[PDB]
Structures are given as C-alpha cells and as structure tokens.
Design a protein around this ligand. Structure first.
Ligand SMILES: OC[C@H]1O[C@H](OC[C@H]2O[C@H](OC[C@H]3O[C@H](OC[C@H]4O[C@@H](O)[C@H](O)[C@@H](O)[C@@H]4O)[C@H](O)[C@@H](O)[C@@H]3O)[C@H](O)[C@@H](O)[C@@H]2O)[C@H](O)[C@@H](O)[C@@H]1O
Ligand SMILES: OC[C@H]1O[C@H](OC[C@H]2O[C@H](OC[C@H]3O[C@H](OC[C@H]4O[C@H](O)[C@H](O)[C@@H](O)[C@@H]4O)[C@H](O)[C@@H](O)[C@@H]3O)[C@H](O)[C@@H](O)[C@@H]2O)[C@H](O)[C@@H](O)[C@@H]1O
Ligand SMILES: [Ca+2]
Ligand code: NA
Length: 701
C-alpha cells in the first residue's frame, strides 16, 4: 500500500522570489517493478501556473523521494494548489503560501512542552511535522514563562537553564531555544504567551506595587485574583491603563523578545469582570482599557524591532457585541484578531455572525478562533467498568447518571483493581480517560498500569456529590496496534476512593471537527487547534491531552489545511465579503436547504470578491445546529442538482467547485446553463458530491 505517501514543502510560507522545494515521497506496494512518471501541476485557483515531470522507476517494495523545484511568483499574498500525478502508482497533493507576512493568513499552532529530555532533533521534528502537514506559520508558545510577572528566570545576570512553571513543570531553556530556532527554519513565527495584567503571588519584592492593581471593591480591599487551589499560588490582576504596570510588563515583553528570540507577544486575559475599581476607588470600565495597553505595547515593540513586533490579544468569550469585542476589534493596534469562544455563540450561525462582526470591525484583518472541540463530551470508544475485570470491588447501580448497566463502587483500599482489555486499531497515542465519582471531601488517587507497567499516579477530583460524574482523569500513552491491558490499582500510598464508570479512548470526533472548521473557514476565520507533536487542542490548558486525533482525522486535517492555504485568497482576502445584503437564494432538489445553518439541512453561505461569486455548501444533514458537540456522519449526497439565483447585475463565465473532501481539494469546472425564472436571474448544475463542505466559486466577467 501507500503509493504517494507524503507531499510537502521544506517551509510553511515563502516570500516572492524564494526557491520552493516540493518533496514527494513515493513507495511501490503493488508487488512489482514500476516505471512511469510523476507529474507536478500547481494552480492559482482555476488557473494552472506550473507543470513539470520526472521519470520514476522503483522495484517491488522500493521507496524514494523526488524533488521538484519551483520559484514563487512575485505577486505577494497568493496561495496555490499542488497536484502530483503518478498514474497507477497513485496521486497526491499539497498547497503553497506565498506571503511576506504571516499575519494576513495566520495558520496558528502551539507549543506547550519544553522538556529537558527533548533533543534538538525531536524539537525540529515536531515543528517540521506541523509545518509540512498543515502549513502552520505561527506558533503560540504556551506556559513557557517562569512567572507571569517575571517570565525569564535569572540567577544574577545569568539565565537559569531550567525552571518550574506554576504547575511545577520543568521548563528547559535549551529545549525552548531549539524549538524557536526550528520555528524560524520553516519561516515560522513564535508568539510568546503572556498575560495583559497578571502577576504571581508575593509580587511586592519584585518591585510591583498593589497601587497599580485592580480591585473588586472601592476600599482597595480585595485585588481581583485567580486561585489555583493550593492556598499558595495565584495570579493577581492589574490595571492595563496604569502607566507603571505598562512600564513594568512591557519591559518584560521586550526582555522576552530580545532574550528568547520571540517574534511577538500573544496577549491573554481572563475575561469579563464587573464593578471594577482602581486602588484609589475610582470605578472603571475594564473593557475599554485593553487597547490603550495594546497600542502602547505595539509601539514599544515596533520601536524595539519592526521584524519582531507582532501582537495579538485574546478577546475571551466571543460573541456578537460581546464584552470588549467592539473596543478591542475596532481600536487596538493588533496584527490580527483572536478570540476564545465559550457559550455565547453555540450555533453555527451565531458563530458565523461573530466572525463577520470581527472581520468588519477590524478592516478585514485576519481572525483566529480558539474553540475547543468536543470540550464537554467524553468522546471516543467506551469500555464499561462494570464489563471489565475487577478485584475486591463489585458493581453497583445506586447513584444516577452512569453509562451502561452501572459502575464499580467502593474502590477504596489496597489490593482493589480494575483491568480493562482494550484494542488499539492502529499504533499511536491514546488518551485513557476515566469517568468517575468522588465525594470523599478530597482528591483521590489510583495507580495506572498499562500492560503490567506502572505509568502514573492519577488524581480524581473531589465533587459536590456522589451523584456527580466527571471525566477529567486521563493520561495519554503510546501504544502498538492490537490488544492491551489498562489497569487501575489501589495500592500503598494511594488515597481516598472513587466510583468508576468507564474507560474511554479519548478521541476527537472527525465529523464535528470537519464541520466546525469548514464553517469557520467559509465564514472567514482560522482555528487554533494543532500543536506540539501532532496533538489537537482539547482544552484551554494546552498541555492537556485528554483527546487524540486518530489517523482518519489527521488526514482530513491535512486536506483541510491544504485547502484553506490554496484557496486563502478566496477564503480570507481583504476584499472577500458576505452577500447577506440583498435577498439571494439557492435551490437543491431532493434535500432541504437553509441560509442560517439550520439543523438537518444543507447550508449555503454566499460571499463575493469583485472577481468571483462564491457559495459554500456545508452539509448539516443528519446533525444539529451546534458546532462544538460531537456529531454523526452526515448524509453524503451524489449527483445533486442546484440552482443559484444571482442579480440582474451578474454575468458568469465559468463555474468552479473545490472541496477538501474530494481529490484533496482540487478544483473541478462544472457544466451549467443560464437564463431567467419568476424568482429572477439564475444558474444551474449538478453537484457531483457533497460530503461535508463544498466551495463553489463562479468567475464573473
Ligand atoms: O485542577 C484540575 C484541572 O487541571 C488541568 O487544567 C488546569 C487549568 O487550566 C486553566 O488555568 C491555567 C492557566 O491559567 C491562566 O490562563 C488561563 C487561560 O487564559 C486564556 O486567556 C487562554 O486562552 C487559555 O489558554 C488559558 O488557559 C494562566 O495565564 C496560564 O498560564 C495557565 O496555564 C483553566 O482555566 C483552569 O480551569 C484549569 O484548572 C486539566 O487540564 C483540567 O482538566 C482539570 O480540570
Ligand atoms: O470522616 C469519616 C470518613 O469520611 C470519608 O469516608 C468516605 C468513605 O470512602 C469509601 O466509600 C466510598 C463510597 O462512599 C459512599 O458510601 C457511603 C456509605 O454508604 C453505605 O452505608 C455503605 O455501605 C457504607 O460503607 C458507606 O459509609 C458512596 O455511596 C459509594 O458510592 C462510594 O463508593 C469507604 O468505603 C468508606 O469506608 C468511607 O467512609 C473519608 O474518605 C475518610 O477519610 C473518613 O474516614
Ligand atoms: Ca458504566
Ligand atoms: Na453538531
């Protein structure tokens, strides 16, 4: 098997003029010798712009790697599709982005691990995989810093080679510096995460004054804080418009750029706080105070280094006219916009409208969303704990909300054990996720053994009652294909007790993820969801690996990111705008349609540039209108008729459709007819295949 195994480029973005080196990795699986050619074609949208061929002979079972050189055309900010054809050996694809500045088309990843064991080679590997497979061109470095108010730890004037972060992880300077070097190698940019307004506890001896702080009340009595739950460890919050706090923390931003080599600062925040005072007791609206900080930030960064002055800011809890949404997106000197969605834009449609507001408020600046998929779902293959092998503990049913036929109780003493026999369909990482109850008044622990080896002590959090199930006890392990044993053991020095409901191989649901990303991108945004060593982002604490992508979803992602890179001019460009105004329409014979992402339908979103009329179809057949929750496989459709009404205005030369779902997102020309109905001007064609997302672009001349 295989054929064309990988297609990718040495770097994630290129400048105009750069030599671009397309690699193609091929392997003959057909138990025979093979001789033929591999043909390279590169398109800018509908138009072929380079073609080339190389002869290829391979014995039975032989692998090789071809290289095709290309030069990036001098028009800046253009994306290209890439096809490789090898006849009977197979085909493949990738995409190329020619853009001098990543902030126009951000494809944002992350890094959250900085382990000392990590070699420069491993660091390059993780960066290289994301850059090659998805064209990630910027990375958010998460929880790299020592302290929030002192990001680089020094002993005298000497940088400490390792340090411990607020959750006691060991951060390595050299690992960090290697990863940054690697990001740069692929023409990546590196964004340091940093708060706008946070110090850590016991701040006064770092010369920070409480008089710079924000307060819950007007007697300067309680400083807004963030409590990490151990009585020691806190963030304290400060006034973004205070000139001393700006002075202090912008000097840290700069230290970070200049010492670590970052290309900018990803500024975070906690979200909405109400009834906010300064030290002196003047009531203040915290939501208008971020962009004066950000303006000042931008200006001291651009003065320090125009090449490394990138800036974004987390608009937390995003939604149409959400807190700080308007002030930030309209008045902050940010290179691009960023927003963490929680529960105010739960429908595909609501989230579309938020993206549109953002894109409109910012002057078609790029928007990136953080939106952790399947966040509330225990998604993946479930193994009931009542159906496993348990010792000195028995099943029960006497507390509601379990899955299956019950759960294992009284898992409270030495020698108690539960063994699950699981199958791993493919070698890879697996998130072992346990659903459980704990009402002992504290944290509870068990020891986790895989195939007879201990792997980690595991914490089970205390809860409001034994009626209440959580599933935030997990650990991620590598596994070979085939059978394995996963075992929890109550041993010596384990504490508390738990009811165990089940084990789950925490898995992102391909269906929901494909839909969510098509929506986001048709709407005009990107999604930060990939990082470290091909992990997908399950939670706001980025080191969290309670879900894993299986290979089926990895491939769809490679397709998705190929797609949004080749078609970035049609998806993201400065002049790409909705057609919401007017009153347009689309008809699909056989299937319901909607313009507002209604449940169990197909969804048209109509957009335009001056060159093209664009309609995205997104297949919500068989699924609700919520973007985040898991979903069923939608009803794929074949040879489906459509008619798109337009205006008396438009004349349409050709019709084109590309989809990540089909031939890796290559563009097909479609046959079609024109004319007029009672409803108005119209055009018509058969959509050969709709799976999750088709984009229809129709050339207007
Ligand atoms: O205690 C059990 C708990 O453990 C893990 O979660 C840990 C916590 O993650 C988050 O808080 C840590 C986070 O706090 C600040 O950032 C918050 C937030 O900032 C936003 O702007 C940004 O978009 C987010 O990415 C970021 O999380 C600090 O600035 C940051 O340095 C620090 O990393 C979360 O808010 C807390 O709720 C969690 O306790 C497990 O992953 C989890 O399952 C478990 O419940
Ligand atoms: O302060 C005294 C102790 O308090 C805590 O003890 C908690 C218990 O932990 C385990 O039980 C887990 C179990 O808890 C409930 O059962 C409550 C009672 O219900 C029945 O009467 C049962 O037959 C009794 O044994 C039990 O007391 C849940 O309903 C059940 O689903 C859970 O699995 C131990 O088995 C108990 O002996 C503990 O009391 C705290 O953990 C201790 O430190 C304190 O000693
Ligand atoms: Ca169960
Ligand atoms: Na859904």
């Amino acid at each position: 098997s295989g054929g064309i195994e990988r297609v990718f480029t040495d770097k994630a973005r290129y400048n105009p003029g750069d030599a671009v080196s397309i690699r193609v990795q091929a392997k003959n699986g057909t138990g025979s010798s093979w001789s033929g050619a591999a043909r390279l074609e590169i398109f800018h949208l509908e138009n072929s712009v380079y073609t080339s061929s190389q002869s290829l002979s391979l014995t039975n079972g032989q692998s090789t790697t071809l290289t095709f050189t290309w030069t990036a055309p001098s028009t800046d900010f253009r994306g290209y599709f890439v096809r490789i054809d090898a006849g009977t050996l197979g085909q493949g694809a990738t995409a190329i982005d020619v853009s001098s500045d990543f902030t126009k088309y951000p494809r944002y990843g992350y890094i959250s691990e900085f382990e000392s064991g990590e070699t420069a080679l491993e660091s390059k590997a993780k960066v290289d995989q994301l850059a090659q497979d998805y064209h990630i061109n910027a990375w958010q470095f998460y929880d790299w810093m020592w302290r929030h108010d002192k990001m680089i730890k020094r002993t005298g004037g000497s940088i400490d080679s390792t340090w411990l972060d607020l959750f006691n992880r060991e951060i390595s300077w050299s690992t960090l510096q290697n990863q940054i070097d690697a990001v740069h190698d692929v023409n990546g940019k590196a964004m340091a995460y940093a708060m706008i307004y946070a110090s850590r506890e016991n701040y006064s001896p770092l010369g920070i004054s409480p008089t710079w702080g924000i307060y819950e009340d007007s007697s300067h009595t309680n400083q807004f804080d963030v409590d990490f739950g151990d009585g020691s460890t806190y963030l304290y919050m400060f006034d973004p418009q205070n000139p001393n706090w700006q002075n202090y923390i912008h000097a840290e931003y700069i230290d970070s750029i200049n010492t670590a080599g970052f290309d900018g600062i990803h500024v975070a925040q906690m979200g909405q706080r109400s009834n906010v005072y300064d030290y002196n007791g003047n009531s203040i609206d915290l939501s208008t105070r971020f962009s004066p900080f950000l303006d000042q930030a931008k200006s001291v960064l651009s003065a320090n280094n125009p090449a490394r002055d990138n800036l974004t800011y987390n608009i937390v809890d995003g939604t149409v006219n959400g807190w700080a949404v308007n002030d930030v997106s309209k008045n902050a000197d940010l290179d691009f916009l960023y927003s963490e969605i929680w529960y105010l834009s739960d429908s595909y449609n609501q989230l579309k409208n938020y993206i549109e507001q953002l894109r409109a408020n910012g002057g078609n600046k790029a928007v990136v969303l953080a939106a952790y998929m399947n966040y509330a779902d225990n998604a993946g293959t479930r193994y009931e704990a009542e159906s496993a092998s348990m010792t000195n503990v028995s099943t029960n049913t006497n507390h509601a909300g379990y899955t299956g036929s019950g759960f294992v109780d009284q898992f409270a003493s030495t020698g108690d054990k539960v063994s699950f026999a699981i199958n791993a369909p493919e070698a890879g990482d697996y998130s072992l996720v346990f659903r459980y109850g704990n009402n002992t008044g504290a944290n509870s622990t068990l020891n986790l053994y895989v195939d007879g080896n201990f792997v980690q002590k595991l914490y089970f959090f205390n809860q409001s009652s034994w009626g209440t199930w959580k599933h935030d006890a997990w650990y991620q392990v590598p596994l070979t294909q085939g059978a394995h044993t996963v075992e929890l053991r109550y041993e010596s020095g384990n504490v508390g007790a738990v009811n165990l409901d089940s084990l789950t191989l925490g898995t992102f649901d391909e269906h929901s993820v494909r839909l969510a990303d098509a929506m986001m991108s048709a709407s005009g945004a990107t999604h930060i969801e990939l990082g470290d060593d091909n992990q997908m982002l399950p939670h706001e604490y980025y080191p969290n690996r309670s879900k894993t992508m299986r290979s089926s979803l990895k491939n769809a992602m490679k397709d998705h990111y190929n797609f949004i890179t080749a078609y970035e001019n049609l998806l993201f460009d400065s002049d790409v705008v909705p057609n919401d105004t007017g009153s347009q329409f689309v008809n699909l014979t056989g299937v319901s349609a909607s313009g507002d992402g209604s449940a169990n339908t197909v969804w048209y979103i109509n957009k335009r540039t001056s060159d093209y009329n664009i309609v995205h179809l997104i297949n919500l057949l068989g699924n609700d209108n919520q973007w985040r929750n898991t979903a069923s496989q939608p009803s794929f459709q074949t040879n489906l008729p459509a008619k798109i009404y337009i205006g008396a205005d438009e004349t349409i030369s050709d019709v084109y459709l590309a989809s990540p779902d089909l031939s890796g997102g290559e563009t097909q020309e479609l046959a079609f007819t024109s004319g007029t109905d009672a409803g108005g001007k119209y055009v018509s064609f058969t959509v050969p295949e709709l799976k999750y997302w088709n984009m229809i672009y129709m050339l207007e001349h």
